[PDB]
């Protein structure tokens, strides 16, 4: 049971914290940390892959993309990401076509991309448009507002509505997808989740105390955030959507939509 999840976004949007909050364990460190010298010396995006085993039983690759949007010149920022995703499809196709095929092919294809938007209230930057227009066509892209506690509720509403109009303006395919095979109950679940994408997430690996009650979140000179409060942020909806309700559909659509499209394009080239 394999599930490969990629995080894309500039350094310091909370990408590693979110992953660790979703799976309730310290899976990954921040790809760059507080050390600027940890940025790739090549001055391009690099893939950072780690492997994990969770419980029901679940084998996970986490792919981070250090260097994405972090440099002065980001004009090739998405190409190593595109190359990695396509390489996984090419590997699987190679294995499918061999004469003495393996009985069980390992699936390294990227099943989900958490794409982190800055919570700046602005339309999609040039970088985001170029990367999204390519990534949405080869992987299940789930947009996320990083550090969404930047926004008041009013600003959050305005920003999320603006981003959804951007998605329509550019005609991006955004997960989840509706299909005619879906029952009316499944379409309504899709419609209600879609209405809060990009997810307004807050991440934290630390527990804080509020009136003796211990939950995990963030405590400051002025603030106390409960990450598992659906009234404060969408972290709980993202977790249920990724790991419970749409996990299998994320794996299936990777195969019968993205990989089949890739495979057909390869076999006529």
């Amino acid at each position: 049971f394999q599930f490969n999840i990629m995080v894309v976004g500039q350094s310091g949007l909370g990408k590693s914290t979110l992953i660790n909050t979703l799976f309730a364990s310290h899976l990954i460190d921040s790809a760059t940390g507080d050390d600027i010298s940890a940025l790739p010396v090549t001055k391009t995006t690099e893939m950072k892959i780690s492997t994990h085993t969770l419980v029901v039983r679940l084998n996970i690759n986490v792919i981070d993309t250090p260097g994405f949007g972090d440099f002065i010149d980001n004009s090739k920022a998405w190409e190593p990401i595109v190359k990695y995703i396509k390489e996984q499809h090419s590997q699987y196709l190679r294995k499918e076509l061999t004469a003495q095929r393996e009985r069980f092919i390992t699936d390294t294809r990227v099943h989900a991309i958490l794409y982190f938007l800055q919570p700046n209230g602005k339309e999609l930057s040039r970088l985001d448009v170029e990367a999204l227009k390519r990534l949405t066509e080869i992987a299940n892209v789930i947009p996320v507002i990083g550090k969404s506690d930047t926004l008041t509720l009013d600003e959050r509403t305005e920003f999320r509505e603006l981003i959804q109009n951007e998605f329509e303006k550019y005609n991006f395919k955004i997960y989840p997808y509706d299909s005619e095979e879906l029952t009316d109950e499944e379409l309504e679940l899709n419609r209600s989740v879609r209405s809060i994408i990009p997810f307004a997430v807050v991440g934290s690996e630390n527990e804080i105390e509020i009136n003796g009650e211990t939950f995990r979140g963030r405590k400051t000179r002025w603030s106390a955030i409960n990450v598992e409060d659906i009234n404060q942020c969408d972290f709980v909806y993202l977790r249920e959507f990724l790991i419970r309700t749409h996990l299998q559909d994320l794996i299936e659509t990777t195969s019968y939509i993205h990989y089949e499209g890739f495979r057909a394009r390869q076999l006529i080239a």
Partner: protein
Amino acid sequence: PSFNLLCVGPDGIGKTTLMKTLFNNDDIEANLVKHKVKIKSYESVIEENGVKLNLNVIDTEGFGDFLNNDQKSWDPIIKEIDSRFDQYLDAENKINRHSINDKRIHACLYFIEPTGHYLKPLDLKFMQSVYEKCNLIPVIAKSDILTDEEILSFKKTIMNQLIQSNIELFKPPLFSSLPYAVIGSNDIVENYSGNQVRGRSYPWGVIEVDNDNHSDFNLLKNLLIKQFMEELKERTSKILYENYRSSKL
């Protein structure tokens, strides 16, 4: 009696809000005088120390939002600084001098994104090209999202980076607290004591602009407006402009 204040930072970082907060005026950007960064110049009249003051806020659009944010892309900002120096120099050199309208930039506020990590390559490059021409005042924008510990750690990293790159900040004759962790809001909200205060209101709490325990907004206000405005103007005139003039000759 003039003051010219330059705001440099990505779009949406909070520049206009901070300007409305500092000068307690929602119309600061009402009068606009008129591939690359675009420069917006706003002129305003604000009373300070009981006297009238001609405030000019200079703003950027599109800084950091290009695919390649090289020097060519933000060079319009440096050209604007130089041009205001060049206007003063031409007026000084005229035979029929007249009481000069001083448009030289007296402070550059550089808005740093609250990542919690470090100064980006673009932040270092821009600040290296500007600090010899303007009083450079870096700030951590939107600092309300940062824990108390993240602020301390992030300030330490930023200061060490600036030292290593030999970037010289403005120092009053406050400095130990740079870069200032600031918040912006010219809007009234109710807090948990039932008082009307300037700030932002979230489900996880209420942060207060005028509360010294919540941010460094007051340190920045002291530095720019209430305490050291004249020191900013004097270093522009006596040191930075004079270095620029002499370097031309």
